[PDB]
Amino acid sequence: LDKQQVQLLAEMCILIDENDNKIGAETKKNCHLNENIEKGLLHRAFSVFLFNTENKLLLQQRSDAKITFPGCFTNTCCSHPLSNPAELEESDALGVRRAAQRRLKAELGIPLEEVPPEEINYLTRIHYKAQSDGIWGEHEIDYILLVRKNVTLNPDPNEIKSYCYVSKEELKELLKKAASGEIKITPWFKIIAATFLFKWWDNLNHLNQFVDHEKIYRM
Ligand SMILES: [Mg+2]
């Protein structure tokens, strides 16, 4: 496996129960092993959907170095808060927003100053489980975050092998090519595009009717 990505496997994730209450901490490696997921290990995560002024969504294609879903197209950023004081903060989901700011800089090279927590809109949470291969997989309650800004980019090639802003029609053609096997997409992107994505995209200026901090949608 890629050395840089192997080093990130030692990061401490936040373990949660099924209602997103923190119950412990565990390494990223252990949180993504199917053998631990099969026993119910679950951690907190987030997914960013970043739109620019032209109302295009910023997608990334994961690098081939990623241990789970390498080379797959997905939304702007999908990662997780760490088990440290700053990112465990539950007030107004500030820990998750701080982690999103941190990873947007680490993966896409977006300056910390362009995406401070006050620019990151927490919409709702989705619970899902998937397998990448026989060894690795995912099991998380994902905080869906939305950003609307014309950021600057300087991505880390270790993280992504490409990025692109897409209009709604372009995302639709992308999804068609994924159905043909032409390209691959991640499960969390597939789930969200099939459920809430186009709904939020049509109301970027009035996301209020779409905010739900109470329910955890079980996908
Ligand atoms: Mg995860």
Tokens 């949180």 found at = 31
**Rounded distance between C-alpha atoms, residue 171 and residue 56, angstroms:** 9
Q: What tokens does 188 get?
A: 């969390």
Cα 5 to middle of ligand 1, angstroms? 14
Residue 57 dihedral angles phi and psi, to the nearest 5°: -95, 135
Query: How remote is the CA of residue 13 from the centroid of ligand 1, in Å?
Result: 8
Which structural technique was applied? X-ray
Whole-angstrom distance, CA of residue 146 vs CA of residue 76:
10
Contact, 94 vs 117, CB < 8 A?
yes
Sort residue 71 into left (φ over 0), alpha (ψ -120 to 50) or beta.
left
Per the DSSP assignment, residues forming a β-bridge with 13 are 26, 82
Residue 137 near residue 157, CB atoms below 8 Å: no
* Rounded Cα gap, residues 212 and 122, in angstroms: 9
177 C-alpha vs ligand 1 centroid, how far in Å?
Answer: 25
CATH number at residue 86: 3.90.79.10
Q: Two tokens at 126?
A: 């989705």
Asked if residue 12 lies in contact with residue 83, where contact means CB atoms within 8 angstroms, the answer is: yes
Distance of CA 8 from the midpoint of ligand 1 (Å): 12
140 is annotated as an active-site residue: yes
Task: Report CA-CA distances (Å) from 99 to 24, 33, 105.
Answer: 18, 22, 10
The one-letter amino acid at 80: H
Of 44, 49, 57, 72, the C-alpha closest to 161 is 72
Q: Is 13 a catalytic residue?
A: no
Show the domain range for 142: 1-219
- How far, in Å, are 2, 73, 80, 99, 144 from residue 44 at the CA level? 24, 22, 6, 11, 11
Q: Residue 21 contacts by C-beta under 8 Å, 6 or more apart in sequence?
A: none
Query: For the chain, how many structural domains are there in total?
Result: 1
Beta bridge pairs of residue 129: 139
Enter the resolution in angstroms.
1.7
Residue 1 tokens, joined: 């496996």
Phi, psi of 67 (to 5 degrees): -70, -35
Which residues contribute to the annotated binding site for Mg(2+)? 32, 43, 138, 140
CA 97, 100, 101: angle at the middle one, nearest 5? Answer: 90
CA distance 70 to 160: 9
> CA-to-CA distance for 217 and 177, rounded, in angstroms?
27
In angstroms, the CA 82 to CA 88 distance is: 7
Which residues are annotated as part of the binding site? 28, 32, 43, 62, 66, 79, 138, 140
Ion ligand 1 residue ranges (Cβ < 5 Å): 45, 138, 140
Closest C-alpha among 87, 108, 114, 113 to residue 98? 87
Cα 42 to averaged position of ligand 1 atoms, centre (Å): 8
Q: Strand 216-218 relative to strand 121-131: parallel, antiparallel, unpaired?
A: parallel
CA angle 100–116–66, rounded 5-degree value: 25
Closest CA to 45 of 23, 62, 28: 28
Active-site residue, selected from the candidate residues 31, 78, 87, 119: 78
* Cβ contact 52:58 at 8 Å: yes
